[PDB]
């Protein structure tokens, strides 16, 4: 003689625990990470003009150290300075 | 090590994607990089309160 | 809240209806409220943090030797900026999550109230978020309720008779 | 929301009533809700940013020559402060606008509910934000509704008879 | 709001009931809503500002002589940090107070609505936040209302007869 009409919202079996103003941990249906905590470990060479300084420091490439002769007139957007750079000239 | 790839944000740890607004890799950055924060994770809810059956 | 349970069987949308009448149980999703909530959520971070700013030349942040005053000042500046940005991130995420939760609760309540206003006197709220309608309401009736064009006047007499005898 | 349209002809206040009865259509504004919203809005920025702070002697922010470390540090400090304050301004304005909008919606809903509670059983909510009252309600009746002293008990019998026949 | 007055005689909880029937006036407190509000309030500052950070070696912040550029820079850095943190504190306290007030108002409204839904047709909202129940409701009835297991169906006939005559 009569009908029935229920109302509801979708749920999921497992939810993600987020933090709000009034809760340390509250479970929601979905959540996205906002902090990028991992790196690919390699430097992309575009769109920035990268200059890898092999065994050369910036000052060594500037002054003209022999093993830095290849760095004359170089240009860069980012100069990447390796830990293995060394000086081999007059102290 | 240098690589043949596309990325706008460079850290000493390598290139990272700049789609997220924050990063916890390194405070030394170059390019259109996210801001460095001390927290390694911050989850933003993209759904409703989750009340499952039972 | 008064729904007390979500529907994991609901995959059509976020909010929807489950009806049961003489013909048989049926289920559908309300696209407008789900789409509204998704649209209001789809951004929600580009509207405050427009983008990643672009930094090219900065101070040194790692030191080999020990200089003194200037290295201390550089360390202090970097630490202050890092702490302030961590607080900004924490507070922003907490506020956005709280507001999103309140928003979805309000959207659910708005859908419930809209349905209740369609069924002016023909239905009674059973209190568990589910309406008992007091007249013949077939699948065309139900899809008119879901449509938003439910004509309450033509069932008013039958509904009132069922209610008040 | 359920009002679906604003009233550009309303200049008396922010929220108000438009009534239609046997005598004729009339319009008035509710001063208490409008005044409450305006009062809550009138400040809303002195209560967070008390004032402009007063700065007298600062660092140099424009440089002619190129020094090196110290100029880089000064540029970095100024850029960090500028970025942080821009984020603070952006977030503050977004939050205040969102809260103001929610506040005005809540005030409208509160006025609607107060009116509905004045008309306990004498009126029915038509769903478009407009009440159909089921008894003789003259201009004195309407201004009593607007006043907040509407006596629902003395129309209860007539209203119930009009409703349930 | 629609309660219009607090109860200083209420010490059992934050929100509660005062009933009056044939037996006599009684008062009790609702523990669930008060406990929920207190639980949501009990933290509310550890969830944003986790703790006090630990600073060991910093810059000099008080100077005896006058150096020049570097002392100016140090003063500027300290002043900028102090101003930014003062703004953060001010905004945080204002937002938390506003949200707490809205939260408690919502909890009061939720308790009122839950009670109203228990009394489906047996009671009428008098508009001052107080229900007039239209049937014999003894102390067991009242504590069932407070309990949340009020059986509205078995008083439906008597209540409807009292209401609509
Ligand atoms: C939560 O939202 C995210 C964001 O849309 C969903 O993740 C994406 O889902 C789409 C669906 O096809 C995929 O194409 C994307 O690759 C997903 N992104 C990532 C980063 O994995 C996620 O599925 C949603 N989860 C729930 C339970 O709703
Ligand atoms: C999904 O839910 C199950 C059980 O509820 C849980 O063990 C698991 O961690 C959740 N997440 C995934 C990705 O399976
Ligand atoms: C629903 O209503 C709209 C407009 O009132 C109408 O065009 C449509 O045919 C109806 N039925 C549907 C969408 O099944
Ligand atoms: C409205 O009500 C107040 C108090 O109940 C009364 O003083 C006043 O005369 C009434 N009529 C008005 C303001 O027109
Ligand atoms: C209240 O209800 C609960 C559960 O329905 C029951 O266990 C209890 O005996 C009732 N009476 C009380 C708590 O006085």
From TrEMBL, chains C, D, E:
UniProt superkingdom:
Viruses
* Main subcellular location of this protein, as a coarse class: host cell
The alphabetized UniProt keywords are: Clathrin- and caveolin-independent endocytosis of virus by host, Clathrin-mediated endocytosis of virus by host, Coiled coil, Disulfide bond, Fusion of virus membrane with host endosomal membrane, Fusion of virus membrane with host membrane, Glycoprotein, Hemagglutinin, Host cell membrane, Host membrane, Host-virus interaction, Lipoprotein, Membrane, Palmitate, Signal, Transmembrane, Transmembrane helix, Viral attachment to host cell, Viral envelope protein, Viral penetration into host cytoplasm, Virion, Virus endocytosis by host, Virus entry into host cell
Q: Any coiled-coil ranges, and where?
A: 31-69
Q: Where in the cell is it found?
A: Host apical cell membrane; Virion membrane
Instruction: List the disulfide bonds in this chain.
Output: 137-141
Q: Under the cellular component aspect of Gene Ontology, which terms does the record hold?
A: host cell plasma membrane; membrane; viral envelope; virion membrane
Record PTM text = Palmitoylated.
Q: Name one GO molecular function term.
A: host cell surface receptor binding
Write out the similarity annotation.
Belongs to the influenza viruses hemagglutinin family.
The record describes its quaternary structure and partners as:
Homotrimer of disulfide-linked HA1-HA2.
Record-given protein name = Hemagglutinin
């Amino acid at each position: 003689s009569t009908a029935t009409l229920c109302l509801g919202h979708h749920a999921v079996p497992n939810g993600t625990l987020v933090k709000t103003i009034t809760d340390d941990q509250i479970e929601v249906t979905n959540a996205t990470e906002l902090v990028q905590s991992s790196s690919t470990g390699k430097i992309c060479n575009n769109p920035h003009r990268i200059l890898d300084g092999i065994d050369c420091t910036l000052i060594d490439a500037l002054l003209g150290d022999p093993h830095c002769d290849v760095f004359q007139n170089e240009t860069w957007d980012l100069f990447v300075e390796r830990s293995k750079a060394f000086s081999n000239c007059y102290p | 090590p240098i690589d043949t790839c596309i990325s706008e944000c460079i850290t000493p740890n390598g290139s990272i994607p700049n789609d997220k607004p924050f990063q916890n890799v390194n405070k030394i950055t170059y390019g259109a990089c996210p801001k460095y924060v001390k927290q390694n994770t911050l989850k933003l809810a993209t759904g409703m309160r989750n009340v499952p059956e039972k | 809240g008064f729904i007390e349970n979500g529907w994991e069987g609901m995959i059509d949308g976020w909010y929807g209806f489950r009806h049961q009448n003489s013909e048989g149980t049926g289920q559908a999703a309300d696209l407008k409220s789900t789409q509204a909530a998704i649209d209001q959520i789809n951004g929600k971070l580009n509207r405050v943090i427009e983008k990643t700013n672009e930094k090219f030349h900065q101070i040194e942040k790692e030191f080999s030797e020990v200089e003194g005053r200037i290295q201390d000042l550089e360390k202090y500046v970097e630490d202050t900026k890092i702490d302030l940005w961590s607080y900004n991130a924490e507070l922003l995420v907490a506020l956005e999550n709280q507001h999103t939760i309140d928003l979805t609760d309000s959207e659910m309540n708005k859908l419930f109230e809209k349905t209740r206003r369609q069924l002016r006197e023909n239905a009674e709220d059973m209190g568990n978020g589910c309406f008992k309608i007091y007249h013949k309401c077939d699948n065309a009736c139900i899809e008119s309720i879901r449509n938003g064009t439910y004509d309450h006047d033509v069932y008013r007499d039958e509904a009132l008779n069922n209610r008040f005898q």
